[PDB]
Design a protein around this motif. Structure first.
Motif, PDB file in Angstrom:
ATOM      1  N   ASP A 295     -53.550  19.280   5.729  1.00 15.73           N
ATOM      2  CA  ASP A 295     -53.287  17.990   5.633  1.00 15.73           C
ATOM      3  C   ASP A 295     -52.293  17.904   4.123  1.00 15.73           C
ATOM      4  N   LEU A 296     -52.356  18.896   3.270  1.00 16.91           N
ATOM      5  CA  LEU A 296     -51.213  18.527   2.124  1.00 16.91           C
ATOM      6  C   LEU A 296     -50.213  18.623   2.750  1.00 16.91           C
ATOM      7  N   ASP A 297     -50.261  19.456   3.555  1.00 21.62           N
ATOM      8  CA  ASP A 297     -49.063  20.344   3.541  1.00 21.62           C
ATOM      9  C   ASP A 297     -48.174  19.132   4.574  1.00 21.62           C
ATOM     10  N   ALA A 298     -49.209  18.573   5.624  1.00 21.89           N
ATOM     11  CA  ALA A 298     -48.416  17.255   6.640  1.00 21.89           C
ATOM     12  C   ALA A 298     -48.011  16.056   5.756  1.00 21.89           C
ATOM     13  N   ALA A 299     -49.312  16.001   4.749  1.00 16.74           N
ATOM     14  CA  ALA A 299     -48.388  14.663   3.948  1.00 16.74           C
ATOM     15  C   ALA A 299     -48.014  14.977   2.928  1.00 16.74           C
ATOM     16  N   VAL A 300     -47.623  15.809   2.591  1.00 19.56           N
ATOM     17  CA  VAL A 300     -46.492  15.741   1.598  1.00 19.56           C
ATOM     18  C   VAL A 300     -44.797  17.760   2.114  1.00 19.56           C
ATOM     19  N   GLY A 301     -45.374  17.636   2.797  1.00 15.55           N
ATOM     20  CA  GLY A 301     -44.614  18.248   4.070  1.00 15.55           C
ATOM     21  C   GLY A 301     -44.554  19.935   2.875  1.00 15.55           C
ATOM     22  N   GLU A 302     -44.921  20.608   4.295  1.00 14.48           N
ATOM     23  CA  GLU A 302     -45.074  22.342   3.364  1.00 14.48           C
ATOM     24  C   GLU A 302     -44.789  23.014   2.820  1.00 14.48           C
ATOM     25  N   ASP A 303     -43.322  22.415   2.515  1.00 10.82           N
ATOM     26  CA  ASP A 303     -42.140  23.172   1.833  1.00 10.82           C
ATOM     27  C   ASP A 303     -42.816  22.807   0.411  1.00 10.82           C
ATOM     28  N   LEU A 304     -42.963  21.237  -0.344  1.00 11.41           N
ATOM     29  CA  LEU A 304     -43.194  21.087  -1.421  1.00 11.41           C
ATOM     30  C   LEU A 304     -45.016  21.910  -1.400  1.00 11.41           C
ATOM     31  N   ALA A 305     -45.839  21.590  -0.562  1.00 12.07           N
ATOM     32  CA  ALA A 305     -46.588  21.991  -0.586  1.00 12.07           C
ATOM     33  C   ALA A 305     -47.318  23.570  -1.386  1.00 12.07           C
ATOM     34  N   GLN A 306     -46.427  24.290  -1.550  1.00  8.58           N
ATOM     35  CA  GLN A 306     -46.235  25.455  -1.095  1.00  8.58           C
ATOM     36  C   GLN A 306     -45.607  26.258  -2.258  1.00  8.58           C
ATOM     37  N   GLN A 307     -44.996  25.051  -3.235  1.00 11.16           N
ATOM     38  CA  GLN A 307     -44.431  25.445  -4.591  1.00 11.16           C
ATOM     39  C   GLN A 307     -45.176  24.238  -5.608  1.00 11.16           C
ATOM     40  N   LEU A 308     -46.589  23.596  -4.772  1.00  9.39           N
ATOM     41  CA  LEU A 308     -47.344  23.260  -5.894  1.00  9.39           C
ATOM     42  C   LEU A 308     -48.632  24.459  -5.797  1.00  9.39           C
ATOM     43  N   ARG A 309     -48.102  24.742  -5.024  1.00 11.92           N
ATOM     44  CA  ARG A 309     -49.557  26.189  -4.967  1.00 11.92           C
ATOM     45  C   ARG A 309     -49.121  27.650  -5.111  1.00 11.92           C
ATOM     46  N   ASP A 310     -47.757  27.405  -5.775  1.00 12.99           N
ATOM     47  CA  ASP A 310     -46.732  28.239  -6.322  1.00 12.99           C
ATOM     48  C   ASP A 310     -46.866  28.435  -8.177  1.00 12.99           C
ATOM     49  N   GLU A 311     -46.649  27.053  -8.342  1.00 12.90           N
ATOM     50  CA  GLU A 311     -46.362  26.537  -9.508  1.00 12.90           C
ATOM     51  C   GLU A 311     -48.402  26.523  -9.942  1.00 12.90           C
ATOM     52  N   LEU A 312     -49.243  26.058  -9.837  1.00 11.65           N
ATOM     53  CA  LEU A 312     -50.366  26.505  -9.821  1.00 11.65           C
ATOM     54  C   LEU A 312     -50.944  27.731 -10.505  1.00 11.65           C
ATOM     55  N   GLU A 313     -50.121  28.901  -9.675  1.00 13.20           N
ATOM     56  CA  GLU A 313     -50.506  30.305 -10.044  1.00 13.20           C
ATOM     57  C   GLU A 313     -50.681  30.519 -11.430  1.00 13.20           C
ATOM     58  N   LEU A 314     -48.476  30.173 -11.502  1.00 15.78           N
ATOM     59  CA  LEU A 314     -48.352  29.961 -13.561  1.00 15.78           C
ATOM     60  C   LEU A 314     -49.215  29.843 -13.979  1.00 15.78           C
ATOM     61  N   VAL A 315     -49.683  28.621 -13.729  1.00 18.11           N
ATOM     62  CA  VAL A 315     -49.593  27.775 -15.012  1.00 18.11           C
ATOM     63  C   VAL A 315     -51.428  28.064 -14.933  1.00 18.11           C
TER      64      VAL A 315
ATOM     65  N   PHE B 228     -40.444  12.576  -5.309  1.00 11.70           N
ATOM     66  CA  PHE B 228     -42.226  12.362  -6.609  1.00 11.70           C
ATOM     67  C   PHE B 228     -43.007  11.999  -4.789  1.00 11.70           C
ATOM     68  N   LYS B 229     -44.330  12.860  -4.568  1.00  6.80           N
ATOM     69  CA  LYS B 229     -45.819  12.180  -4.104  1.00  6.80           C
ATOM     70  C   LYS B 229     -46.616  12.188  -4.250  1.00  6.80           C
ATOM     71  N   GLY B 230     -47.110  12.423  -5.761  1.00  3.34           N
ATOM     72  CA  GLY B 230     -48.365  12.485  -5.732  1.00  3.34           C
ATOM     73  C   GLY B 230     -48.600  13.318  -7.308  1.00  3.34           C
ATOM     74  N   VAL B 231     -50.012  13.394  -7.731  1.00  2.00           N
ATOM     75  CA  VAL B 231     -50.635  14.719  -8.381  1.00  2.00           C
ATOM     76  C   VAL B 231     -51.464  15.093  -7.381  1.00  2.00           C
ATOM     77  N   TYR B 232     -51.909  16.083  -8.455  1.00  5.60           N
ATOM     78  CA  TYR B 232     -53.000  17.151  -7.682  1.00  5.60           C
ATOM     79  C   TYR B 232     -54.122  17.490  -9.038  1.00  5.60           C
ATOM     80  N   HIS B 233     -54.981  17.013  -9.213  1.00  6.94           N
ATOM     81  CA  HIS B 233     -55.706  16.982  -9.874  1.00  6.94           C
ATOM     82  C   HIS B 233     -56.546  18.895 -10.139  1.00  6.94           C
ATOM     83  N   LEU B 234     -56.539  18.962 -11.224  1.00  3.87           N
ATOM     84  CA  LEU B 234     -56.542  20.437 -11.316  1.00  3.87           C
ATOM     85  C   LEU B 234     -58.247  21.203 -10.957  1.00  3.87           C
TER      86      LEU B 234
END
Length: 178
Positions: free
Chosen positions: A36-56, A1-7
RNA sequence: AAUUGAAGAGUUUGAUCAUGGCUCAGAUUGAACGCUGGCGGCAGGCCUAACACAUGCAAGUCGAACGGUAACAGGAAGAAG
């Protein structure tokens, strides 16, 4: 758990581990594609955020205040009440959207909150311990009108007029004057 | 005119009288308990722990004592709702 992205604010609040006793430092990362989201969260987790957000976006809903007040969509907040993270948004959401005092129905009329002339209704006589009394202290809601300490009221049921003096205000599971 | 009011019975013995205790009928209560319970008048109500107490109230009042303006009120030299 790294935090939440506000939509809707389009930014990322960063979770810090174990500051659950106070409020942590609000640490935001602005863009959803901010490197910096990639840097602060790791680019791996950062893309899964981006992917999930697409589906969402293809399977969810935009928050509509009208449908929320109609009880047809719920604003979903993700968080952790233990880490004290996520609580304040849902509060911002609470203040922003949630109804001022509503009309309660009666066998007489729609009772507007806006009205004067005091109109409460009990609803509970809490498991009264209570440090030095039987008290009971019935919990009343206040539908309309302003209560003032010395005012005279009418118990509709027993049809007897009653003067009020000691009328509790509960500062969190605790009697308070008044 | 204003204190002029006093009752005994049961039980020791095979029976008797006397002695003598026990017990009962009366009046009384800040009473309690059991069963019961419809009104009203008047009065009474921690006798126990001088034990410990949340909350409200139980002592304040005078500007015809004084400097005074913090509020509501009248009016003001001037502008005006």
């Amino acid at each position: 758990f790294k935090g939440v992205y506000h939509l809707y604010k389009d930014e990322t609040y960063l979770y810090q581990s174990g500051k659950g006793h106070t409020i942590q430092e609000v640490r935001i990362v602005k863009g959803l594609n901010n490197p910096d989201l990639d840097a602060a969260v790791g680019e791996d987790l950062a893309q899964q955020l981006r992917d999930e957000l697409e589906l969402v976006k293809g399977a969810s809903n935009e928050f509509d205040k009208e449908l929320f007040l109609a009880g047809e969509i719920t604003p979903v907040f993700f968080g952790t009440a233990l880490g004290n993270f996520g609580v304040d948004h849902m509060l911002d959401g609470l203040v922003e959207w949630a109804p001022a005092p509503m009309p309660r129905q009666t066998d007489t009329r729609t009772v507007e909150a806006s009205e004067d002339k005091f109109t409460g209704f009990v609803f509970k006589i809490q498991a009264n311990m209570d440090p030095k009394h039987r008290d009971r202290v019935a919990f009343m809601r206040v539908v309309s009108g302003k209560y003032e300490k010395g005012m005279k009221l009418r118990q509709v049921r027993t049809a007897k007029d009653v003067v009020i003096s000691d009328a509790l205000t509960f500062m969190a599971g605790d009697r308070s004057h008044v």
